[PDB]
Amino acid sequence: KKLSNPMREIKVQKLVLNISVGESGDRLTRAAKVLEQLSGQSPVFSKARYTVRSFGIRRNEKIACYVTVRGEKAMQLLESGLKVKEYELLRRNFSETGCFGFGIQEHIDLGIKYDPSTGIYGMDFYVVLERPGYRVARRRRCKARVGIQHRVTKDDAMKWFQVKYEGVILNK
């Protein structure tokens, strides 16, 4: 019973890149293509849930796209995103459930050549940190809660980010 157990190592479970553009059409397709070329997998479109006149969206209009990346590709994407952010994250960017994320304004900073037709697209970076044994909550048979001592906390995620990436966390 100690914190040095190899099973307590914190690893990046997945990285989700989300692009939320109000309109649907050519812009949505271009954003989906950007996500596909940046992640290497086919993205998934998200439909609007309600109708908001001010935003200009309608129910079931495909007003967003996103992709889920795991493994080495996710780590490389996270490293590039942090490089764009200069390894600078706010203390509020970390959630109480051992997760953190950030955003970028231009996808060109991630290594994509500018195309005037495509335009400029920002993105949302969210990283989910988990320890081995989280499967007990995702499996179908015998679904159970992960022990609160084994769950990744805000402090654990902040320390992991500080140690691995040598990052600096600001209060502001």
Partner 1 sequence: FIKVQKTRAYFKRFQVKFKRRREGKTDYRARNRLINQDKNKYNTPKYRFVVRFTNKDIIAQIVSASIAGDMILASAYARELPQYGLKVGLTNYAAAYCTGLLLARRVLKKLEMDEEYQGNPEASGEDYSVEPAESRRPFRALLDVGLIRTTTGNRVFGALKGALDGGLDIPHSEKRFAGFSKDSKQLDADVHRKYIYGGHVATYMKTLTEDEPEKYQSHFSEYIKQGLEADDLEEMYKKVHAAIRADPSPKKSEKQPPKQHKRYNLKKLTYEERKAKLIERLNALNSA
**Binding-site ranges for partner 1 (CB under 8 A):** 140-144
Q: Rank residues 71 and 111 by Cβ distance to partner 1 and give the closer one.
A: 71
CB of 135 to partner 1, least distance (A): 12
Nearest approach in angstroms of CB 101 to partner 1 is: 22
Q: How far is CA 104 from CA 67, 108, 118, 163, in A?
A: 16, 10, 17, 23
CB-nearer residue toward partner 1: 142 or 148: 142
DSSP assignment, residue 26?
H
**CB-wise, 85 or 151, nearer to partner 1?**
151
Q: State the nearest-atom distance from the C-beta of 113 to RNA, in Å.
A: 18
Q: What is residue 45's three-state secondary structure?
A: strand
From RNA, partner 1, none, interface partner of 42 (C-beta below 5 to 8 A by class): RNA
Helix residue ranges per DSSP H, the chain:
26-39, 72-84, 135-138, 154-165
Indicate which of RNA, partner 1, none lies near residue 97 (CB less than 5 to 8 Å, by partner kind).
Answer: RNA
φ/ψ of 27, rounded to 5, equals -65, -45
Q: How do strand 11-20 and strand 123-130 relate by DSSP bridges?
A: antiparallel
Which does residue 51 touch among partner 1, RNA, none (CB within 5 to 8 A, set by kind)?
none
The interface partner of residue 124, options being RNA, partner 1, none and the CB cut-off 5 to 8 Å by kind, is RNA
